[PDB]
Structures are given as structure tokens and as C-alpha cells.
Amino acid sequence: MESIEQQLTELRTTLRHHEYLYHVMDAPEIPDAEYDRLMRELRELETKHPELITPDSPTQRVGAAPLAAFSQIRHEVPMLSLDNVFDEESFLAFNKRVQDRLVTWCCELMLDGLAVSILYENGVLVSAATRGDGTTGEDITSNVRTIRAIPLKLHGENIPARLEVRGEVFLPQAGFEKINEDARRTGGKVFANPRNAAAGSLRQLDPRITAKRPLTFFCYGVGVLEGGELPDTHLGRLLQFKKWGLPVSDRVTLCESAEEVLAFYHKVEEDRPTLGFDIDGVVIKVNSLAQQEQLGFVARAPRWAVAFKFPAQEQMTFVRDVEFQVGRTGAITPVARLEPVHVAGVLVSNATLHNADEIERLGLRIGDKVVIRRAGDVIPQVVNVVLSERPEDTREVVFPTHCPVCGSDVERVEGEAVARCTGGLICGAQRKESLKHFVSRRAMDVDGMGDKIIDQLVEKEYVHTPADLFKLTAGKLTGLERMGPKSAQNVVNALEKAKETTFARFLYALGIREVGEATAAGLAAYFGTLEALEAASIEELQKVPDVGIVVASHVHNFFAEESNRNVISELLAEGVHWPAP
Numbered sequence: 001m002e003s004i005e006q007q008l009t010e011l012r013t014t015l016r017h018h019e020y021l022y023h024v025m026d027a028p029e030i031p032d033a034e035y036d037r038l039m040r041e042l043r044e045l046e047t048k049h050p051e052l053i054t055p056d057s058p059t060q061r062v063g064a065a066p067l068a069a070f071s072q073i074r075h076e077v078p079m080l081s082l083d084n085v086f087d088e089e090s091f092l093a094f095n096k097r098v099q100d101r102l103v104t105w106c107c108e109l110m111l112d113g114l115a116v117s118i119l120y121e122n123g124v125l126v127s128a129a130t131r132g133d134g135t136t137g138e139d140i141t142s143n144v145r146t147i148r149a150i151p152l153k154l155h156g157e158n159i160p161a162r163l164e165v166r167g168e169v170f171l172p173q174a175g176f177e178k179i180n181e182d183a184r185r186t187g188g189k190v191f192a193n194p195r196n197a198a199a200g201s202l203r204q205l206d207p208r209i210t211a212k213r214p215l216t217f218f219c220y221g222v223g224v225l226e227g228g229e230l231p232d233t234h235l236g237r238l239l240q241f242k243k244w245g246l247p248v249s250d251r252v253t254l255c256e257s258a259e260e261v262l263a264f265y266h267k268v269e270e271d272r273p274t275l276g277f278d279i280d281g282v283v284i285k286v287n288s289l290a291q292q293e294q295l296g297f298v299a300r301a302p303r304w305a306v307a308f309k310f311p312a313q314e315q316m317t318f319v320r321d322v323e324f325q326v327g328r329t330g331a332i333t334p335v336a337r338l339e340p341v342h343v344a345g346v347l348v349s350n351a352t353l354h355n356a357d358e359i360e361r362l363g364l365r366i367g368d369k370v371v372i373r374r375a376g377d378v379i380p381q382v383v384n385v386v387l388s389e390r391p392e393d394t395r396e397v398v399f400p401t402h403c404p405v406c407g408s409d410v411e412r413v414e415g416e417a418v419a420r421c422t423g424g425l426i427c428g429a430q431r432k433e434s435l436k437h438f439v440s441r442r443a444m445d446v447d448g449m450g451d452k453i454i455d456q457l458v459e460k461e462y463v464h465t466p467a468d469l470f471k472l473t474a475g476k477l478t479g480l481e482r483m484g485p486k487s488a489q490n491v492v493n494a495l496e497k498a499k500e501t502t503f504a505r506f507l508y509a510l511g512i513r514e515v516g517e518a519t520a521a522g523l524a525a526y527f528g529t530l531e532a533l534e535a536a537s538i539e540e541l542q543k544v545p546d547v548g549i550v551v552a553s554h555v556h557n558f559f560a561e562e563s564n565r566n567v568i569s570e571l572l573a574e575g576v577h578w579p580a581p
């Protein structure tokens with residue numbers, strides 16, 4: 001289409017743009033898979049037109065320049081990247097190229113974190129650096145000493161006088177999710193994924209910040225080596241590092257054929273959801289150091305290793321709509337409907353938006369291109385909007401003011417992330433739990449109205465509100481499973497007796513959000529009657545001891561919703577009774 005010269009400048013500009021956001025800012029806008037796609041396109045163009053490769057092309061360079069706000073460390077041996085493949089056929093082609101230019105493979109989990117180079121002198125940790133641009137990195141020595149998995153001293157015989165240990169610092173998934181949940185609720189930085197949370201946690205001027213983040217580390221390789229020797233195979237070196245106290249993954253594996261490599265790759269992909277940390281693939285390395293040294297390096301990567309990538313855990317797609325799911329207790333979760341896309345190999349077409357505050361934090365509009373993440377058998381999540389690709393036609397996301405299931409008021413209370421349907425007494429989405437609550441022991445306490453009886457009444461649409469329970473005839477109950485004429489009359493009798501209650505237990509039975517047994521008793525004692533309570537403003541409700549803004553808001557919004565007032569009127573009409581004050 002466009003001239004090859006225009007294609008080249010566009011690709012180089014785009015790749016550097018995202019390299020800056022990823023390597024320098026730990027804040028990428030596009031998925032790793034999209035960057036990898038663009039890099040493949042540039043590689044294909046340069047392979048067809050090798051005369052157009054420049055020494056500063058992204059295919060010839062590593063990482064990004066180190067932040068000058070950090071002290072800087074010149075690696076004593078260059079740090080590089082890895083060239084990659086995405087399918088078995090391409091790995092086999094790499095295997096053949098290697099065989100024809102010289103084999104045992106040392107095969108390792110490819111950890112999705114950031115690279116670090118740790119210098120030990122006489123077995124003592126003396127410095128540690130990020131990769132930077134492969135020549136100069138950022139001094140993160142103080143930060144690395146907060147990482148328990150990285151030893152400060154090596155213990156053993158034959159420790160070389162000077163040794164750079166290289167490995168990946170990374171942040172397990174549970175630690176990542178905690179950091180992001182906290183950040184969403186406090187206004188801090190929300191990270192795209194564990195890689196970026198690990199990088200941002202590590203690359204702190206103040207190491208006390210790093211120390212509070214659950215970073216860990218695995219070794220994977222060697223930089224400078226002086227004043228001593230190491231084993232003559234890569235796995236041998238890793239096992240020596242392990243003996244000296246450095247952390248080595250228990251999945252490092254030898255393979256004596258290309259087909260063994262494929263078997264390991266596929267088992268690791270199968271085991272991926274169980275590991276507790278992100279891996280973007282497996283790294284496959286010529287095991288013999290002599291063979292590694294013969295093959296050497298190109299500008300960006302070794303010629304003796306390949307990153308065999310998995311289908312990526314983040315992908316981009318378009319938001320076609322936003323649906324608002326109503327949960328069993330009235331929570332309204334915004335869920336994006338998406339153009340279908342495979343994430344980590346699994347076809348998905350929705351993703352959670354968490355809540356209304358998160359929609360606003362994202363800046364999401366219908367029609368946006370978004371990054372979504374799926375790591376495990378869970379609903380995917382929207383990560384961010386790809387704002388640089390926002391179409392000219394997008395639509396505002398209007399969070400519902402009324403429940404999409406029952407039409408009752410939706411409530412959002414300041415400081416609370418979750419919006420809720422207020423119509424707990426009528427909402428179909430809440431009906432099973434609301435009726436079970438209503439007849440429970442500390443509420444109306446109806447003998448024989450068990451969960452399986454309630455389930456049938458709801459599923460057959462025989463009951464829609466708690467008032468309908470008192471309208472049940474013995475004949476209608478008899479028609480249910482688990483019910484006979486005797487138990488049907490038993491529960492009709494039990495419902496008639498249950499009309500005798502207290503103001504506190506009736507209030508508790510209504511199922512207002514956050515109103516526990518003690519709060520119900522306090523509201524009943526303060527206001528004395530239902531008429532006084534149902535009239536109270538939020539400020540009036542806040543007068544009550546142990547009732548704050550959240551409970552006051554829920555109570556006021558509950559009684560302001562017409563469907564609740566209608567059910568309460570019906571309950572009184574059916575004869576529910578409590579003592580006057």
C-alpha cells in the first residue's frame with residue numbers, strides 16, 4: 001500500500017512510542033501482543049528490504065534509555081533481548097538453523113517481569129541494575145535488598161571473585177490484584193498487569209516503597225565472570241547458582257530433541273493457570289556453553305536462544321455495548337460487551353468494568369478500543385482504553401439510574417464503589433435471597449419456608465414479594481415438590497403466626513443493605529414507629545447512634561423507592577403486626 005519508506009518510518013515511530021510507555025514509564029497503552037505484531041511487521045519489511053535497516057532500528061536495539069533520575073550502572077557484559085517465535089513450526093525452523101550452524105536444550109519458564117543484573121563481588125551483593133538500554137541500567141541496589149528471594153551473600157566453594165547474576169524480578173498475581181484493587185479505591189496508579197506492577201514497584205527512588213511490595217526473583221543467566229569458573233552447561237550454571245543460595249525455578253528442564261521441547265512447552269501452557277505468576281512463554285537455550293559461544297549474538301539478542309511465546313493474556317478489541325448485571329443482593333456490575341477475541345487462547349466476548357467509578361477512571365466510551373486481560377478461568381477485565389485509537393463515533397456510557405431488571409431506583413453512595421438496586425423487596429434478581437432473608441430466624445422466622453420451597457415459588461413465579469408469602473393458600477403450596485398437604489398447611493399456619501413480630505425484627509426482615517440486627521434495633525428504638533422512620537432524611541438518620549452516612553443513605557433510599565413502600569403497605573394490609581410504642 002504505502003511506500004516502503006513510509007511504512008518503515010511509521011513502524012519505527014510506533015514501536016519507539018510504545019517502548020517508551022512500557023520500558024520507561026511502566027504504563028503501556030497497547031497489549032504486548034500488539035507490540036509483538038508490529039515488531040513482526042517491521043522484521044518482515046526489513047527482511048524483504050535489508051538495505052533499509054539502520055543501526056538504530058528497533059530490530060537492532062534493546063529496551064530504552066535509563067532514567068537519569070537514577071544513578072546508572074554500565075553492565076560489564078551487554079544485556080540483550082530475545083528473538084521470539086509463536087508456533088511449533090517456527091520453533092522447529094529455529095532448531096534446524098541452530099543444528100545446521102554448529103545440541104541439548106535448557107528450557108525455562110519465561111517470567112513476565114523485568115530484567116535485573118546483580119553483581120556479587122567475593123560472594124557479596126554489591127550492586128543491582130535494571131537493563132535500561134542493554135548497555136546502561138538504573139541503579140536499584142537498595143530496592144533489590146528488600147527482595148527476600150535475592151540473597152545478599154552466596155555460600156559455597158568455588159564462588160568467582162566477580163559475578164553478574166541475571167534474572168527476572170516479578171510480582172505474583174495475588175500481589176498484583178491487591179495493588180490494583182487498592183489503587184482503584186485510593187487514586188493511585190493502576191497497573192496494566194503484573195509485569196508493569198513489578199517494574200513500577202522496583203523502579204522507585206525511595207526503596208522503602210519497594211519494600212512494601214511482594215516482589216520475588218528467579219535467576220536465568222550470567223553476565224560478567226571474573227576470577228573464577230562456572231560449569232560448562234547453562235543448566236549446570238543454574239544448578240550451581242541454586243547451591244549458592246540463588247532462587248532457581250523447579251521447572252527448568254533439559255530436552256534432547258526438538259520434540260521434547262514441544263512436549264515441555266505444551267505442558268507448561270496447560271499448567272499456566274496454576275502457577276500463581278505470569279509467564280509469557282518458555283525460553284529455549286542451547287545448553288552447551290561452547291555452542292553458545294560459537295553462535296554468539298546479533299545486536300538485539302543471542303543466536304543460541306529463542307522465546308517461544310504463549311497466546312497472550314492481554315488483547316485489544318472494541319466495546320460494542322455495556323450491560324449492567326444485577327447480582328443476587330442488588331449490586332449492579334457494568335460488563336462490557338466486546339467484539340469477540342481470543343485471550344490466552346480462549347475465545348471471550350465480555351469483560352468486567354468493576355463499577356461506575358472505574359468506568360469514569362478509564363474514560364471509557366461505547367465504541368472505544370480497549371485492552372482486556374484474562375489470566376485464569378475468570379471473567380476478563382478491561383485494562384485501559386486505547387485512547388490513541390478512539391474512533392470519531394463513540395457514545396457516552398450512561399450508568400443506569402433505574403434497575404434494568406425491576407425498574408427500581410439505583411443508589412450510589414459517596415465513598416462506596418458499588419451501585420445497587422434499591423428494590424430488594426421486588427427485584428427479580430434479588431428475590432430468592434430477599435425472601436430467604438425475610439423468613440430467616442432473626443427476621444420473620446417462618447418454620448418450613450425452606451430455601452428449596454422459596455426457590456420453587458420464585459422459579460414458578462408464584463411469589464414476587466414477601467407480601468405474596470402471606471397470600472399463599474395450602475392448595476398452591478401443595479403443588480410444589482417437597483410439599484404435601486400436611487406440610488403445606490403447616491407453613492400456611494406458620495406464616496399466619498409469623499405476622500406477630502417486633503418493629504426491630506420487621507425492619508431487619510426488610511433487608512436494607514448494611515442493616516444488621518443491632519442496627520435494626522437501634523433504628524426501631526430511636527424512631528419508635530414506622531411512620532417516623534419512613535419519613536427520615538439522611539441527616540435525620542445520621543442522628544441515630546451507630547448510624548453513619550452509608551447506613552443512613554441506604555435506609556433513606558430504601559424508603560424513597562416506591563416498590564418498597566408498596567410491599568410494606570401490602571404486608572401491613574395482610575396483617576403483619578408489632579407493638580405500638
Ligand SMILES: NC(=O)c1ccc[n+]([C@@H]2O[C@H](COP(=O)([O-])OP(=O)(O)OC[C@H]3O[C@@H](n4cnc5c(N)ncnc54)[C@H](O)[C@@H]3O)[C@@H](O)[C@H]2O)c1
Nearest residue numbers: 018019022028030031032035081082108110111115220283
Ligand atoms: N505493551 C507495549 O507497549 C510494549 C512495548 C514494548 C515492549 N513490550 C513487551 O516487551 C517485550 C519485548 O522486549 P524485551 O526485550 O523486554 O523482551 P522479552 O521480555 O520478550 O524477552 C527478553 C527478556 O526475557 C526475560 N526473561 C524472562 N524469563 C527468562 C528466562 N528464563 N531466561 C532468559 N530471559 C528471560 C529477560 O529479562 C529478557 O530481557 C515483549 O513482551 C513486548 O510485548 C511491550
Ligand SMILES: [Mg+2]
Nearest residue numbers: 111112113280
Ligand atoms: Mg519480558
Ligand SMILES: [Zn+2]
Nearest residue numbers: 403406421427
Ligand atoms: Zn432491581
